[PDB]
């Protein structure tokens, strides 16, 4: 079983680029991170920051999650992110995505020891 901390890193971290490299970034990344294996994941966000800066968010401001849970944390700085949304003509197994770049505060839910992000909750 992949851990929840490892799954967050696979689904949401891209420390290798400062921002989406092209309008095909999401098509490429949703495939290579295996987010289209048995269905098209309808939306996803990648964070273009170091793993240490995103893990640090779990020590920053404690806030409510989108669903009202209270183990969420909001980043002190805005972070570079890419939002991936499935296109209307996308049809598993042939998944297609629109790439949109943003720079926003991120909110993540954290768990565990070590206490790390296990869920990307929102950008604000």
């Amino acid at each position, epitope marked *: 079983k992949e851990t929840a901390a490892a799954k967050f890193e696979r689904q949401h971290m891209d420390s290798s680029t400062s921002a989406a490299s092209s309008s095909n970034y999401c098509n490429q990344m949703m495939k290579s991170r295996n987010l289209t294996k048995d269905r098209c994941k309808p939306v996803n966000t990648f964070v273009h920051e170091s793993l240490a800066d995103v893990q640090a968010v*779990c*020590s920053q*401001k*404690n806030v409510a999650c989108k669903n009202g849970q*209270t183990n969420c944390y909001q980043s002190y700085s805005t972070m570079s992110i890419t939002d991936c949304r499935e296109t209307g003509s996308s049809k598993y197994p042939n998944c297609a995505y629109k790439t949109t770049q943003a720079n926003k505060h991120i909110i993540v839910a954290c*768990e*565990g020891n070590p*206490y790390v992000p296990v869920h990307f909750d929102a950008s604000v």
Partner: nanobody
Framework: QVQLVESGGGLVQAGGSLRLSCAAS????????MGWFRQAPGKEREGVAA????????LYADSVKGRFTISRDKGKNTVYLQMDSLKPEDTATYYC??????????????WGQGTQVTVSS
């Protein structure tokens, strides 16, 4: 550095009462949930009581309902546990925790060093 400073607890006779206290220092914001967990030797850590910073969302383990009472100073990072009618099975190390949700220990990221509570017979 955040420090959760716990006080109180210790040795008491079965049937007796004790209070535990915990004040967080070093955190620049408000922890929405704080709580009390406990672990006996050899057993898994268990949530005892938790409360949110508005004085609501109060939750207790079934085995302490009616006997234990949690409280916080409204809007601040302090939490207290009054324990009455103590039983030998309440003997454990008790931990304050901050920053999680309800009684789910995996969600809490800041932990006190732990305070022994010993209930004798």
């Amino acid at each position: 550095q955040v420090q959760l400073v716990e006080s109180g607890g210790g040795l008491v006779q079965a049937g007796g009462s004790l209070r535990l206290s915990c004040a967080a220092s070093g955190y620049a914001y408000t922890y929405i949930y704080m709580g009390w967990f406990r672990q006996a030797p050899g057993k898994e850590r268990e949530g005892v009581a938790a409360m949110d910073s508005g004085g609501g969302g109060t939750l207790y383990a079934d085995s302490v309902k009616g006997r234990f009472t949690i409280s916080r100073d409204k809007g601040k990072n302090t939490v207290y546990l009054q324990m009455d009618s103590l039983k030998p099975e309440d003997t454990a190390t008790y931990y304050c925790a901050a920053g999680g949700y309800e009684l789910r220990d995996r969600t809490y990221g800041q932990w006190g060093q732990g305070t022994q509570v010993t209930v004798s017979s």
